[PDB]
Paper text:
C-di-GMP is a near-ubiquitous bacterial second messenger responsible for the coordination of a variety of cellular processes and behaviour, including motility, biofilm formation, virulence and cell cycle progression. DGCs catalyse the condensation of two molecules of GTP to yield the twofold symmetric c-di-GMP product. DgcR from Leptospira biflexa is a constitutively dimeric prototype of this class of diguanylate cyclases. Here, we show by biophysical and crystallographic analyses that DgcR is a constitutive dimer that changes coiled-coil geometry and domain arrangement upon pseudo-phosphorylation.
The structure of activated DgcR_AxxA (called DgcR’*) obtained by BeF3- modification was solved by molecular replacement to 2.8 Å resolution. There are two dimers in the asymmetric unit that show virtually the same Rec dimer structure, but slightly different α5-helix bending and GGDEF orientations. As in DgcR’, the dimer is formed by isologous contacts between the α4-β5-α5 Rec faces and the extension of α5 forms a coiled-coil, but with an altered relative disposition, which will be described in detail further below. D56 is found fully modified by BeF3- and its immediate environment is different compared to DgcR’ as will be discussed in detail hereafter. The GGDEF domains are arranged symmetrical with the two bound 3’dGTP ligands facing each other, but too distant for catalysis (bottom). Comparison of native and activated DgcR’ shows that, on activation, the hydroxyl group of T86 is moved towards the BeF3- moiety to form an H-bond. Furthermore, K108 forms ionic interactions with BeF3- and E12 in the activated structure. Activation of DgcR is accompanied with a change in the backbone structure as identified by a DynDom analysis. The Rec domain can be divided into two parts that undergo a relative 16° rotation as shown in Fig. 3b.
Numbering used by the authors:
A (entry chain B), B (entry chain A): 6 to 298
The structure:
Amino acid sequence: RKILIIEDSELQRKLLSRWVSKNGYIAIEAESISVAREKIISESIDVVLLDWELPDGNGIDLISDILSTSPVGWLPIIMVTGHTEPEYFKIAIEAGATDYITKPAKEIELLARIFSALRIKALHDQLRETAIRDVMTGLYNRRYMEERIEQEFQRCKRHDSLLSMAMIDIDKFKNINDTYGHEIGDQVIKQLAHELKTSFAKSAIISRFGGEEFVILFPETGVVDATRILDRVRENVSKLEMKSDTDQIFHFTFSGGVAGGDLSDIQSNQELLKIADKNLYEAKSSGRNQIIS
Amino acid sequence: RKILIIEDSELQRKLLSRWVSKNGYIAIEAESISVAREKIISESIDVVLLDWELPDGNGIDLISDILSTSPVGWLPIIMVTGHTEPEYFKIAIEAGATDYITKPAKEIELLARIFSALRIKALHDQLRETAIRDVMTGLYNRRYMEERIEQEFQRCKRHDSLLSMAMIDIDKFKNINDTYGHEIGDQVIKQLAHELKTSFAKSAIISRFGGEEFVILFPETGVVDATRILDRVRENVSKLEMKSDTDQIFHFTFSGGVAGGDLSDIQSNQELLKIADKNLYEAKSSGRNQIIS
Ligand SMILES: Nc1nc2c(ncn2[C@@H]2O[C@H](COP(=O)(O)OP(=O)(O)OP(=O)(O)O)C[C@H]2O)c(=O)[nH]1
Ligand SMILES: Nc1nc2c(ncn2[C@@H]2O[C@H](COP(=O)(O)OP(=O)(O)OP(=O)(O)O)C[C@H]2O)c(=O)[nH]1
Ligand SMILES: [Mg+2]
Ligand SMILES: [Mg+2]
Ligand SMILES: [Mg+2]
Ligand SMILES: [Mg+2]
Ligand SMILES: [Mg+2]
């Protein structure tokens, strides 16, 4: 849907952008490398059209940086340059570009190569989601959340920016499987997953870390702010009326351990895990159905 | 690794083929639509180079058939044609083609667009493997085995070919977790996984279907032959000396339900599941540590 066009020439850039917007895409113009970096950071991009010679650098150098910013990890990049030498073609593709059009770009071909780029991007995005999300709940699975804590932790140390973590665990869940069966247990987990998915800010990262265990990172959020939010959700879950398959009404609760905030005195990300884990056991021994931070 | 090249012209085809094999790919040549059909059916292909005007029809008609032989339903297809009309470009891409070179093809561009196609394919295939594999055992998970039974069922019906299925479940495994802990339980599961991985042929498809449950497809194997194989594995498992965390020796066994063979009477793949499931319950009620078929 959203396409970023990096070209120094006014005439060429306004032309390309008219063509692309005309077929129902959103066009994002960038007159320079400097303005391109600004647009990548600030807007989710599906395809890039990339000039080679910009007034403030070379497209090749920007390819690397685009792929490492991409929140999904791969993005189709199509070169649109005056450079016609086959050596320049091989270099761009090897640098990470997907396609390469020599100027002047022709409208029919351009829109068809964008079609082909977005088709592959759509398949990639689906394959990615099935690899990193848990099948039953559609939350992030463990093997991916581990990598994302690491990469999210480092990111917030190499910046003066807060990062709170919650670890939650369903109260007396083995008792629920024994009373109402595995199949009702599965439904309770699915219901909690759906409440977590819809209750937090869009930046919050939610994982199904174990059978009945969940971990949530809150970027740019203090420990106190994360705790009030998670305590509203815990209140909401406690007042849900669940039905068994024999029309028995029942409630469930979860316990929470919160950690992080100011990360100054926390050295590795695994120290963040253990503070949250210690707090969750605090919550379990302190009467359950509560958050501790 | 394997590239299919469909071109009517011997000079062009042997040239393209030399270029591709030169960069460490295997080249499969096809002089005509007729010979291409026979190569697609008989060899798994990573990329196709596709001429449009063949003596016995049009490449575009072949695109659809190529995409449906991919087990996930998508393959990089690069048009390499004399056709320079924008309508031929738009229709090839819309038909399913990924890329399009106008003749005369240059070696550098050709191999760089192949690189681009195979780079995407390699990332997709890795994302796929992480989505279909269970982390603990490294076997196929449930969501994938369900789809693969369907795929293998239909494919064994569209041939006069046998297909046996086993369903197994560990005997008194809750007792093993309760006596020796969750972590010894995890090792017992892993031990069974290792026995399955090393006991069956190359052709066997092995899945972790539940916590402690496994299903195995045996292509071109009778029910009687699948039963002795799974019974030799059951004998091997029963004679393993397992250690607790306090150097206590113990044995574990599984019960087996086998199904399928001649597929003539069998209507859907779900019927295969239930016959195996029924047999496994028979095996559990009959004294456990045994196979029933
Ligand atoms: N239905 C269902 N049950 C599960 C699943 N995964 C684990 N369980 C069950 O939930 C149990 C959770 O164990 P615990 O951490 O001991 O929690 P608990 O026994 O409920 O008690 P508490 O959390 O309050 O300590 C373990 C397992 O028996 C699942 O995917 N589905
Ligand atoms: N350690 C471990 N235990 C698991 C895992 N997944 C499930 N379990 C446990 O295994 C239990 C198996 O129970 P059942 O399938 O009823 O079989 P069983 O109790 O072994 O008895 P039987 O098949 O002989 O009737 C369910 C759960 O307690 C796992 O991943 N690891
Ligand atoms: Mg320029
Ligand atoms: Mg619990
Ligand atoms: Mg737990
Ligand atoms: Mg069992
Ligand atoms: Mg079982």
